[PDB]
């Protein structure tokens, strides 16, 4: 594609969704979290359309990538928001949760641990916002070998932009390649968390205690 690495970064920075607010028992907390997740999905759908390349995909492929990536994207967003809060997940500014409230829902605290672990990892690496928005675009375009040369070429471009950022930050060639690898290895842990999250969320629907909205039910039907 045509734009520069820096124009690529401004475009992604500007398309970023806003942070949303929230309004315990295993029901009252799953209520809050699925309410938030639902409202964020609406913004993500509009954000995705602003990921360069994405609006030139068939509406079929757009559906598919979103279905594959949506929880991964929610999770990396949450992890990013929580970076400067050791031990806590900032789901919303008025919903800052420590590890132990995770015990409020069965099956959750282990997903919570994986998210705190990731946040810490970002903290350690001192991930920048510019790198964040690239990672987030990669997740969207990559996570749907499922069913495209065009997609792989947008992916090369984002790799270029990432390297570009690291080059400007004054990293050696060796450090650029090493940092690039580190960041992309974290995405496979994010994929892993999303898989675990899709199961847990499913096992909640099935019990039918918490009430999931329609957009949210459709996503969770797409994973069959």
């Amino acid at each position: 594609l045509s734009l520069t690495a820096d124009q690529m970064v401004s475009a992604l920075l500007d398309a970023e969704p806003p942070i949303l607010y929230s309004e315990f028992s295993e029901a009252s907390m799953m209520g809050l979290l699925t309410n938030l997740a639902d409202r964020e999905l609406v913004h993500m759908i509009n954000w995705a359309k602003r990921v360069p390349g994405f609006v030139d995909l068939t509406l079929h492929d757009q559906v598919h990538l979103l279905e594959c990536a949506w929880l991964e994207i929610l999770m990396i967003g949450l992890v990013w928001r929580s970076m400067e809060h050791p031990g806590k997940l900032l789901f919303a500014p008025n919903l800052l949760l420590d590890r132990n409230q995770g015990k409020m829902v069965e099956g959750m605290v282990e997903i919570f641990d994986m998210l705190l672990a990731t946040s810490s990892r970002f903290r350690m690496m001192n991930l920048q916002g510019e790198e964040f928005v690239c990672l987030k675009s990669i997740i969207l375009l990559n996570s749907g070998y499922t069913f495209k040369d065009h997609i792989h070429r947008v992916l090369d471009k984002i790799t270029d932009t990432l390297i570009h950022l690291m080059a400007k930050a004054g990293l050696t060639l060796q450090q650029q390649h090493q940092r690039l690898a580190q960041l992309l290895l974290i995405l496979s842990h994010i994929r892993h968390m999303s898989n675990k999250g899709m199961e847990h969320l499913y096992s909640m629907k099935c019990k039918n205690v918490v009430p999931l909205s329609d957009l949210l039910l459709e996503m969770l039907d797409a994973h069959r």
Partner: peptide
């Protein structure tokens, strides 16, 4: 159509 499908267009 899928809900998603139309949120995607929506003018």
């Amino acid at each position: 159509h899928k809900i998603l499908h139309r949120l995607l267009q929506d003018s």
